[PDB]
Design an enzyme around this catalytic site. Structure first.
Site, PDB file in Angstrom:
ATOM      1  N   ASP A   1      23.428   5.395  20.826  1.00 52.85           N
ATOM      2  CA  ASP A   1      24.247   5.177  21.991  1.00 52.85           C
ATOM      3  C   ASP A   1      25.438   6.116  22.110  1.00 52.85           C
ATOM      4  O   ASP A   1      26.081   6.334  21.057  1.00 52.85           O
ATOM      5  CB  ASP A   1      24.779   3.725  21.906  1.00 52.85           C
ATOM      6  CG  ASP A   1      24.710   2.983  23.220  1.00 52.85           C
ATOM      7  OD1 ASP A   1      23.667   3.109  23.909  1.00 52.85           O
ATOM      8  OD2 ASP A   1      25.687   2.277  23.555  1.00 52.85           O
ATOM      9  N   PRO A   2      25.844   6.597  23.258  1.00 54.37           N
ATOM     10  CA  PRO A   2      27.082   7.343  23.421  1.00 54.37           C
ATOM     11  C   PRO A   2      28.245   6.406  23.086  1.00 54.37           C
ATOM     12  O   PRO A   2      28.177   5.186  23.263  1.00 54.37           O
ATOM     13  CB  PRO A   2      27.167   7.682  24.912  1.00 54.37           C
ATOM     14  CG  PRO A   2      25.735   7.556  25.393  1.00 54.37           C
ATOM     15  CD  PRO A   2      25.151   6.437  24.578  1.00 54.37           C
TER      16      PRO A   2
END
Length: 225
Positions: A60-61
């Site tokens: 995930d960012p």
């Protein structure tokens, strides 16, 4: 071959264009989405297909303000170094000769040396981890990894975590070099990430083959007059 040569068709698939239009919707829905639109594909901007030496997957960012800017694990200059990258630095300090703790978390200089810093999910709602994980990005990054496997030779894949390892199962471990460890986040870093020695091993592979190893000390953009 460039990314756009090999990805042009994928990027006209309905799932992919729908991912983008959903992100665009969410950006105007009252919540903030990270990273900004111009940054979502920065791993590809900074590391062309023919320039990929090392692939490091994130998942995930980062989902806080000023953190994500389109490169796995990296943050903008001025932002505190997140726990996952601190743990990467700790392993680097323990293994690469001359390495010392950087005073920033910005990894553009890795990407410009051929380190593809690819999150498997490329957007996130602010403060809400994994919130875009069912939007279509995993299909896209599946294809991206498949294309590197097919169209490149001798890439080093550092697969950290079960998620990344699952995603890289299709990679030809004879044609490419796949190294596995737990994720560097605090939950698991001391259960196998420390001691993985991946940074030194990646460089020894590259050297083996007449490629310049990676200078893992990341460098901040300079001032000009």
């Amino acid at each position: 071959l460039t990314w756009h040569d090999v990805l042009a068709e994928e990027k006209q698939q309905p799932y992919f264009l729908n991912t983008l239009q959903t992100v665009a919707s969410e950006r105007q829905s009252g919540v903030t989405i990270y990273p900004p639109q111009k940054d979502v594909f920065n791993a590809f901007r900074f590391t062309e297909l023919g320039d990929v030496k090392v692939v490091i997957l994130g998942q995930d960012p980062y989902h806080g303000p000023g953190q994500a800017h389109g490169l796995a694990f990296s943050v903008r200059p001025g932002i505190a170094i997140p726990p996952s990258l601190l743990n990467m630095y700790k392993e680097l300090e323990n293994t690469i000769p001359g390495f010392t703790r950087p005073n920033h978390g910005y990894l553009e200089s890795w990407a410009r040396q051929g380190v593809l810093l690819l999150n498997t999910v490329l957007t996130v709602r602010a403060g809400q981890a994994h919130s875009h994980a069912s939007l279509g990005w995993e299909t896209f990054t599946d294809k991206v990894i498949s294309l590197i496997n097919q169209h490149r030779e001798g890439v080093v894949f550092l697969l950290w975590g079960s998620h990344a390892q699952k995603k890289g199962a299709i990679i030809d471990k004879q044609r490419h070099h796949v190294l596995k460890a737990p994720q560097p986040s605090p939950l698991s870093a001391h259960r196998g990430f420390f001691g993985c020695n991946h940074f030194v091993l990646a460089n020894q592979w590259l050297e083996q083959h007449g490629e310049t190893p990676i200078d893992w000390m990341p460098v901040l953009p300079a001032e000009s007059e």
